RNA sequence: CUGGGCGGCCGGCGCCUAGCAGCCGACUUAGAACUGGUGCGGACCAGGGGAAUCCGACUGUUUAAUUAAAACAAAGCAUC
RNA sequence: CCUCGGCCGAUCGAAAGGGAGUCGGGUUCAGAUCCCCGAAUCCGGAGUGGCGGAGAUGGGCGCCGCGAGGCGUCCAGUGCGGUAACGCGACCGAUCCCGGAGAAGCCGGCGGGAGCCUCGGGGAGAGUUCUCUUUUCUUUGUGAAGGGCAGGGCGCCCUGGAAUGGGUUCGCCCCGAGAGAGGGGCCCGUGCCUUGGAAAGCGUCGCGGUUCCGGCGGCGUCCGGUGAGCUCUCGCUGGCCCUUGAAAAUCCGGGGGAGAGGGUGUAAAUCUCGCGCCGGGCCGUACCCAUAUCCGCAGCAGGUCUCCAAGGUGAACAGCC
C-alpha cells in the first residue's frame, strides 16, 4: 500500500538539493488548496559531514562532523523514495508548513533538524543517510 | 539613396566583416561592425539536442568578465548538465547501488546455505 | 551614462571626491542635474521647478557648477 | 503522376532504364523512415552510409548502406546467439 | 479590425446563431459596352519549322595564338 | 630536500580563417573610428587591504532593566528564494577529472527585425502659373555602453489525462516516452522609450563683429498607412550526399574535497558585487585601385580580387529613359 509515510528517506530529484538525502516529516497525499498536488515536508542535508579517520585529532573531528540542513516541501514527482528509513524525533511544532511565511521560524526549523542530525550522526547509526550519493 | 562604404581595410564579405545599418545623430547612415552570435553551453550528457538554460549565449572570451551567476544554474552540474539527465543519473546511481547490495546479500546468503 | 531616480542618491554622487562638475540644464518640461565622475555621467531628471531650485541651494560647496544657457 | 518511374523521375532520360530501375529500389530504402526498436517511434532516418539515427530517442545505430538491417547481419546475429548458447549449455 | 442586453455594475429582466452593423485596405483575375484610317507584346526585350541519314549515349573536357570534333573523360561491363 | 608532472616535442606558416575591447559631433590645402570636444569600453597592475557592500552577525540558559534594552555563560553560522523549469549583487577552495564555447557543408521554403522604395496628411524653402493645378521638387536625426518594455524562439517546468482521436504548417509534423487546455521558466533582443540628448547636427528666417568667431538669436526637426516589394540580418523547419563539409591558441562551467578561518569578536579567511587609483610599448596608415598612378616597352579598345546599389516600364540586377 502507501509508503510515503513519515520517517522514510527520499532523494531529491530537482532543484538546489538535487541528489541530496532527506526524510519525510509530514506527508499530504491529497491536494491542499494552496498546492493541489501531493507533496511532503522534508528535512534534509545540504552539507554532509566530512569523513573522519583515526589519525585526525578531536578538534579536527568535531569541525569535520558538522551538518548543514534544509527544510522544504516537495512535489512527490521530485522525490525518489528509498527503502531506508530514519526515525529521528524531529519536533513537529518547529518543523511545520507555517515555517515558510516567516524567515525567523525557518531558521528555527533549520537549526532543530541540524541539531538532531548531528546527534544521530555521532552515534554511528543510519550510516547510509549521512553518506553523500555519488552521481 | 545614400550608399555605404566599409569603415575598415577589409574589403571582403568574410565572417569577421559583418555589419549592420545605424542612423547617426548627424542624420547619416553608417556601418556598425557586429559581434558574432554566441551559443549557450551544450549539455555534457551527449543526448540532449538543445542548449542549456539560464546561461548567457556570449562569445567565449567575454565569458570571463561576467559574474558567476550568469554562467551557471543553482544545482549540481549546474551550468554543464541539463536537469533531465542530472535527474536520471541520481536515479541511475541509486538504483544500481541498490542492486549491488541485493546481489551481495543474495550471494552471501547462498554461500552460507551451501 | 547612468540615470539616478532619487535625490538622496544624487547628493551622495555629488559629494564624491571623484565628482568634477555639476551641469544644470533647463528644458521645456524638466531640469536635468548632471554630475561628471570618473566613469559615469550621472543625470537626475526633475519635473518640478520648486524642487529644482531647492537642489541648487543644497549642492555641495566647492564643486564646480555650470549652467547650460 | 507517373506510371512506373516513381522516385527516379528526377533523373529523366539521363541514364539507362535498367540502371534507373536498380537505383529505384535502393533509393526508396535509403530515404525511408523505419520504426525505432528502442523507443517504438517511426523516426529512424539515415545520417550517412551505414549510420542510422532516431530523432526522438537520439540513438545512433550502425546499419546497412541503404537499408537499416542487412540480411548478412541478421544471419550472423542469429548464428552468434546459437554459438553462445552451445558454449553455455 | 471592433462590437455585440462623467464612468461603472449587485442583479432575473437580455440572445450576436440563413453572420449582422460600423470602420479600414492593397493587389489582381474574369466578363461587358463604347471607340480609333483593323492599329495595339506599336519602341525595347524576344525560339523559324518539319521529314530523315551518319557519329557520339547524355552533362562535362580538350590543342592559350589556325583544328571544340565523331577526339578525351564519364557511369556501366569485364579482365589481371 | 620530499610531493606532484605525457607536451601525444623546437620553430615557421593567413594584412580574406580563429582572435577581449570605440562610437557620435567638429576640425585640414592635403590626416583621422588615429587630431579636438563628448560619452564609453577591454586587458593588466595595485603587496604594504583604496572605500563600501557580502561572508555576518542568530538561538538557549539565566540576571538587571517597570518594561525596552544591556551583563555572564553555552551552542550555531564558507548566503538566500522557488514544487519545478530556474532566480537574486556577491555567495571560499588546490593537485586531479569530465564537459562546453572557439567549431562548421550546400540548396529550398516560411516567419521576425531593420534599411530602401511606396501612399495619405502637417511644417519650412524652391519651381511653374498663357490656362489649370489647393499643385510639383527638396528636407522633415538621435552613436556606442547601461535600464525598462515590446517582439521572436524554445526536444524547459507544474497541474492534468486524450478515440467520436485531436493539435497544427505554405509544406510538414506532434502526442500515454504525456496531445489539446491553463499557468509559468529561459535565451535573444541590431526594435521602441529612456540616460547619453539637444547643449550637438540639419532646414529656414534674421542680427553682429570681421576672414574667422563650432559667433548670436527666433521657429522647426510632426502625425499616420501599407507590402509574396528589394537588400541585409536573426530564427524555425525541411531536401541532398558511396561528398558529411578544419585545427590550435584562448576563455568558461561542472565533479571531488586535499586545505584555510574565527571562537561570539563587531570578528576571520574569503568575494566572478558596486564605486575609486595607475598603465597599455613597436610597426602600417597620404594617394591611384584603372578606357591616365598596377602588368602588357606607352595616358596601349587587352588583363587584374571585392563592398554599397534610387524612380518609371517590365518576369527581372534584361534592354530603354
Ligand atoms: Zn528511437
Quick synopsis:
This is part of a larger assembly, with chains A (135 residues), B (114 residues), C (69 residues) and D (89 residues). With 69 residues, chain C is of the alpha/beta class. Chain C has two helices and five strands, in the order βαβββαβ.
Helix-strand blueprint:
This is part of a larger assembly, with chains A (135 residues), B (114 residues), C (69 residues) and D (89 residues).
Chain A: E1 8-12, E2 21-28, E3 39-47, H1 58-64, E4 68-75, E5 79-85, H2 103-122
Antiparallel strand pairs in A: 1-2, 1-5, 2-3, 3-4
Chain B: E1 19-23, E2 29-33, H1 83-113
Antiparallel strand pairs in B: 1-2
Chain D: H1 17-31, E1 44-48, E2 51-54, E3 60-62, H2 71-88
The complex binds zinc ion.
The structure holds two RNA strands.
PDB class: ribosome
Keywords: Spondyloepimetaphyseal dysplasia, ribosome
Entry title: RPL13 (eL13)-mutant 80S ribosome from mouse
Can you tell me about this structure?
This is part of a larger assembly, with chains A (135 residues), B (114 residues), C (69 residues) and D (89 residues). In chain A, 20% of the residues lie in helices and 27% in strands. Chain A contains two helices and five strands, in the order βββαββα. Chain A has helices spanning 58-64, 103-122, and strands at residues 8-12, 21-28, 39-47, 68-75, 79-85. Chain A starts with 7 loop residues before the first strand and ends in a 13-residue tail after the last helix. Chain B is α+β, with helices and mostly antiparallel strands and 114 residues long. Chain B is built from one helix and two strands; from the N terminus they run ββα. Chain C is 25% helix and 36% strand. The longest helix of chain C has 9 residues, at 49-57. Chain D has 89 residues and is of the alpha+beta class. Helices cover 37% and strands 13% of the residues of chain D. The chains are: A alpha+beta (135), B alpha+beta (114), C alpha/beta (69), D alpha+beta (89). The A-B interface holds A 11, 13-16, 18-19, 80, 82-83, 133-135 and B 74-76, 83, 86-87, 89-94, 98. Residues 36, 38-39, 41, 54, 56-57, 59 of chain D line the site of zinc ion. The PDB classes it as ribosome. Keywords: Mouse liver 80S ribosome, Spondyloepimetaphyseal dysplasia, RPL13 (eL13) mutation, ribosome. RPL13 (eL13)-mutant 80S ribosome from mouse.
Amino acid at each position: 500500500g502507501k509508503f510515503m509515510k513519515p520517517g522514510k528517506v527520499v532523494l531529491v530529484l530537482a532543484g538546489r538539493y538535487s541528489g541530496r538525502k532527506a526524510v519525510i516529516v509530514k506527508n499530504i497525499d491529497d491536494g491542499t488548496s494552496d498546492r493541489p498536488y501531493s507533496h511532503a515536508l522534508v528535512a534534509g542535508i545540504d552539507r554532509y559531514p566530512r569523513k573522519v579517520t583515526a589519525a585526525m585529532g578531536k578538534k579536527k573531528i568535531a569541525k569535520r562532523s558538522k551538518i548543514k540542513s534544509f527544510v522544504k516541501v516537495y512535489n512527490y514527482n521530485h522525490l525518489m523514495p528509498t527503502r531506508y528509513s530514519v526515525d529521528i524525533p524531529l519536533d513537529k511544532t518547529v518543523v511545520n508548513k507555517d515555517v515558510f511565511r516567516d524567515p525567523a521560524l525557518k531558521r528555527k526549523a533549520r537549526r532543530e533538524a541540524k541539531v538532531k542530525f548531528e546527534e544521530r550522526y555521532k552515534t554511528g547509526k543510519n550510516k547510509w543517510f549521512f553518506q553523500k550519493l555519488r552521481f | 539613396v545614400q550608399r555605404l562604404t566599409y569603415r575598415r581595410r577589409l574589403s571582403y564579405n568574410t565572417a569577421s566583416n559583418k555589419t549592420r545599418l545605424s542612423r547617426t545623430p548627424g542624420n547619416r547612415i553608417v556601418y556598425l561592425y557586429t559581434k558574432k552570435v554566441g551559443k549557450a553551453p551544450k549539455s555534457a550528457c551527449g543526448v540532449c539536442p538543445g542548449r542549456l538554460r539560464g546561461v548567457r549565449a556570449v562569445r567565449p572570451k567575454v565569458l570571463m568578465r561576467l559574474s558567476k551567476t550568469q554562467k551557471h544554474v543553482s544545482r549540481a552540474y549546474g551550468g554543464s548538465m541539463c536537469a533531465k539527465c542530472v535527474r536520471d543519473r541520481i536515479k541511475r546511481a541509486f538504483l544500481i547501488e541498490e542492486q549491488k547490495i541485493v546481489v551481495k546479500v543474495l550471494k552471501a546468503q547462498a554461500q552460507s546455505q551451501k | 551614462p547612468r540615470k539616478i531616480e532619487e535625490i538622496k542618491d544624487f547628493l551622495l554622487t555629488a559629494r564624491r571626491k571623484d565628482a568634477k562638475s555639476v551641469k544644470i540644464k533647463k528644458n521645456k518640461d524638466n531640469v536635468k542635474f548632471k554630475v561628471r565622475c570618473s566613469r559615469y555621467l550621472y543625470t537626475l531628471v526633475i519635473t518640478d521647478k520648486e524642487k529644482a531650485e531647492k537642489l541648487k541651494q543644497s549642492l555641495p560647496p566647492g564643486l564646480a557648477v555650470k549652467d547650460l544657457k | 503522376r507517373t506510371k512506373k518511374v516513381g522516385i527516379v523521375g528526377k533523373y529523366g532520360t539521363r541514364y539507362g532504364a535498367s540502371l534507373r530501375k536498380m537505383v529505384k529500389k535502393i533509393e526508396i530504402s535509403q530515404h525511408a523512415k523505419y520504426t525505432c526498436s528502442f523507443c517504438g517511434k517511426t523516426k529512424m532516418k539515415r545520417r550517412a552510409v551505414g549510420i542510422w539515427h532516431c530523432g526522438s530517442c537520439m540513438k545512433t545505430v550502425a546499419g546497412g548502406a541503404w537499408t537499416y538491417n542487412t540480411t548478412s547481419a541478421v544471419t550472423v546475429k542469429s548464428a552468434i546467439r546459437r554459438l553462445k548458447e552451445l558454449k553455455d549449455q
